Each structure stands twice: as C-alpha cells, then as structure tokens.
C-alpha cells in the first residue's frame, strides 16, 4: 500500500513545515520512495495499466445479438424437428 502513506506524509508536511530541514528531507525521500514503488508496480503489470468507454457497450451489443440469433435458430430447430 502506498496511498494512505502518501496521504499521511502529505499531511504532516502541510501541518508542520517548522520541522528542521532534516525531517523535511527525510520525509520527502520517503514520498519519493513510495511513488518510486508506485511507478514500479504500475510498470510490471499490464492489466492494471489497461485499467489505469463505448467498447463495453459494443461488446454487450455483440453478445446480445449473438444470443438472440442463437435463440432464433434454436426456435427454428425446435419447430422443424417436432415433425
């Protein structure tokens, strides 16, 4: 997890700038660490980057048209074979 850690470190930055430069540098390094691991984790996984809008509707339309043509041909087969 990097999201809550980024949030929290962000907030103690914005709450206490009066901390000595040591804490500021260390904490900024920590955020750079978290976003470095963030970009790495984005990098190795293609699926997330794909996740990271009409195509779904087109797939639904093709699925429903193939379903209805299957239903129609099965109805025709049922009607014909009963003789």
């Amino acid at each position: 997890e990097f999201i809550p850690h980024i949030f929290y470190s962000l907030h103690q930055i914005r709450k206490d700038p009066n901390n000595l430069s040591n804490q500021l540098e260390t904490l900024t390094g920590s955020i750079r660490h978290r976003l470095k691991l963030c970009k790495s984790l984005i990098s190795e996984n293609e699926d997330t980057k794909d996740l990271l809008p009409s195509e779904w509707q087109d797939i639904i339309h093709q699925r429903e048209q193939e379903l209805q043509i299957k239903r129609d041909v099965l109805d025709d087969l049922y009607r014909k074979l009963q003789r």
């Binding site: 900024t28 955020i31 750079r32 970009k39 984005i42 980057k49 990271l52």
Partner: peptide, 23 residues
Amino acid sequence: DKLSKVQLYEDLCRYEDTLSKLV
C-alpha cells in the same frame, strides 16, 4: 498504446511530474 489511451495513466504521469516539481 492501449495503456496510454486510458485517462488514469496520464493521471499518474502528471502526478509524478507534480511531485518532481515539488521535490
């Protein structure tokens, strides 16, 4: 090319850029 097509990729990109500016 497909990955660059979805917005959240650009979102992480300029988020990284903004933190680069901040650091």
